[PDB]
């Protein structure tokens, strides 16, 4: 174990560079407030003493715009209906929840939204009746591809007036793709007599039309859903009130933090203006990167707590909420611990069926590639997303290869003999810093886009290699000590 004093020094350095970079980004935003306001409209509110919120982000300004109008009221109605069903008719709770989900989808997306969800569900079920996993995967891929077609997009836009309902329908269908694909694959793999009647059409309708995750919520494993819908054990509503109170308090705190950190610094406006990235100093570049990844983390905390809170009230166990990205230090850790539900779906339904490590390293590579391909194609399959997927697969493959190489008994014995485990920890932290220096760039490409990632690569690494790259590596080195030191808690 490392001595406590120098680990505390590493934590101090990590917090110091986070906070100084945040201050630099705040200064840059304040000194460039007028031109950014002129180019992109900035929302004016009295929540923070007159500071102007940066509404350039799409997911935040879309989900809060929907929540203030329809989503929060419908989610509260779902909570009330679930509690009433648990109190009065516990046996028929899944069907009541399914009916409420259909009614909520109708009232929020018109008849076409419900009709399209039903069509996708029915087609997936009819195809899965053949009990072939490959045919089911092609059916799911075709159903997902029907979203990206220009003609279908034009028809769907003609369906709706506000043009935000079309985006809501697209997101709902994209999530439904995963949900009915998971159910269909589970039906294909079902060979147990006890579970023969669990995979029926009404159960598929109940699984698909679950309101908390109808639109954006995390992928809920069908095994857990079917297990919890049939417990017939009450949740002691007196404790459910306390659970709701604590969840609401935490969600309000998270939302306030997200609003504060969007108000103080205009991350999205700065990334939208590529010419401003070249002008601002390297400290501002690092601060923008850290603030952007942290804001994505906080935004998805807010956007996943509400489905998680609704599940916890419903008795379900939700997938674990994202861990703080300032803890993350490697590609595998980021994938395992950030988006738990989608990672579990990819492992169970995309990674394993193609074939995991059982086919050897080369086969593993293919499997990983396939998984990554799908997730990129799931998010839209844009060019920047494909570049992010390629870079991310390269990172994961390099991590796995190095871990396999170092864990060989001969090399492990040699490194144990040469130096103490303290030196091994220091070298592992330096390596993980060199890895996270590219992990953050890949995530910036995912968030900022191709231009933002290229600008970061040029300025941080190519243009300023002699001292800027070394300083970034050292700061991420202390950061990696902190991350690895905390990683033992959840290892």
């Amino acid at each position: 174990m490392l001595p406590r004093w120098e680990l505390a020094l590493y934590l101090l350095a990590s917090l110091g560079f986070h906070f100084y970079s945040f201050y630099e980004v705040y200064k840059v935003s304040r000194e460039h407030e007028e031109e950014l306001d002129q180019e992109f409209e900035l929302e004016t509110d009295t929540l923070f003493g007159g500071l102007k919120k940066d509404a350039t982000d799409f997911e935040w300004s879309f989900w809060m715009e929907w929540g203030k109008q329809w989503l929060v009221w419908l989610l509260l109605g779902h909570m009330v209906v679930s509690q009433m069903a648990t109190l009065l008719a516990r046996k028929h709770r899944p069907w009541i929840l399914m009916l409420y989900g259909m009614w909520a989808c109708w009232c929020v997306l018109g008849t076409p939204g419900v009709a399209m969800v039903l069509l996708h569900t029915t087609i997936s079920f009819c195809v899965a009746q053949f009990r072939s996993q490959l045919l089911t995967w092609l059916c799911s891929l075709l159903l997902l591809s029907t979203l990206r077609l220009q003609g279908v997009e034009e028809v769907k836009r003609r369906w709706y007036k506000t043009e935000n309902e079309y985006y809501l329908l697209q997101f709902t269908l994209t999530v439904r793709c995963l949900y009915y694909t998971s159910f269909s694959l589970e039906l294909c793999w079902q060979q147990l007599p006890a579970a023969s009647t669990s995979y029926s059409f009404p159960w598929m309708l109940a699984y698909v039309f679950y309101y908390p995750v109808l639109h954006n919520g995390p992928i809920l494993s069908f095994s857990e859903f079917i297990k919890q819908m049939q417990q017939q054990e009450h949740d002691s509503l007196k404790a459910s009130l306390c659970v709701l109170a604590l969840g609401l308090g935490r969600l309000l705190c998270w939302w306030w933090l997200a609003e504060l950190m969007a108000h103080l610094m205009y991350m999205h406006a700065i990334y939208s203006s590529i010419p401003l990235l070249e002008t601002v100093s390297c400290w501002t570049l690092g601060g923008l990167a850290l603030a952007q990844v942290l804001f994505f983390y906080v935004k998805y905390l807010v956007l996943f707590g509400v489905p998680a809170l609704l599940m916890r009230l419903d008795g379900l166990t939700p997938p674990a909420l994202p861990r703080c990205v300032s803890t993350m230090f490697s590609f595998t850790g980021m994938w395992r611990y950030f988006d738990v539900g989608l990672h579990n779906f990819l492992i169970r339904y995309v990674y394993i069926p193609v074939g995991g490590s059982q086919h050897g390293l080369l086969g593993t590579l293919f499997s990983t590639a396939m998984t990554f391909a799908f997730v990129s194609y799931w998010h839209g399959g844009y060019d920047y997303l494909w570049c992010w997927a390629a870079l991310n697969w390269l990172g994961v493959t390099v991590e796995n290869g190095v871990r396999r190489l170092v864990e060989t008994p001969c090399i492990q014995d040699s490194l144990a003999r040469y130096f103490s485990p303290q030196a091994r920890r220091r070298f592992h932290a330096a390596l993980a810093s060199c890895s996270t220096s590219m992990l953050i760039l890949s995530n910036l490409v995912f968030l900022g886009g191709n231009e933002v990632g290229k600008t970061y690569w040029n300025r941080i690494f190519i243009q300023g290699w002699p001292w800027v790259t070394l300083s970034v590596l050292g700061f991420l080195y202390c950061y990696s000590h902190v991350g690895i030191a905390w990683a033992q808690t959840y290892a």
Partner: antibody
Amino acid sequence: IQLVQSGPELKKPGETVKISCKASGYTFTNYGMNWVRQAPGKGLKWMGWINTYTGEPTYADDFKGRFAFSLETAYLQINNLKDEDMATYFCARVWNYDYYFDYWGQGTTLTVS
Amino acid sequence: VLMTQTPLSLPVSLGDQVSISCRSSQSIVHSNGNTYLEWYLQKPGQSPKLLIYRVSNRFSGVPDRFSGSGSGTDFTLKISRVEAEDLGVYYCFQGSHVPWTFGGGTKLEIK
């Protein structure tokens, strides 16, 4: 539809043995496979099962840490470390609905002494 | 789940009705709304054969005289007329609660 097993097997207490269950007359991956054992002085004990479609075995709590189910798709093998157990091992096809075991193997009597 | 059988050894002469009771430790009714309790006849020196799959149901091989009716916890199997070819060991098996457990075994003998 029939299931045929390897045959009698004699092994030393320290060694290990593999028992094969070959299924014919039906789509092998359609139905899972159940491995049970019958001790000379006891009744049937359900050791575990293997999902032929995905190859994911689930074992009973008692029969864990030493037994492993593998595929050869249409034989299906079991591996274990030898010990005082000398039970006769049965292989059973499991039907999709309403009942568990329909067709059984002959059973490979195992002698470990 | 521990499942016991009464009687352990049941001697009946040829052509006489026989009743075998299987008592479970707890409820066998699965969450699906049905109970998976089935009865296996293992003749000496071979593998068991299924007789009734769900309560009061009958397999294709079993003749009409193997009707067995049971409650939620205590189940029973009845042979109206023993044809002297039904001798063997009868095991009651539950599939609802993992791990799946067989019965002790009710050996039949000619008195």
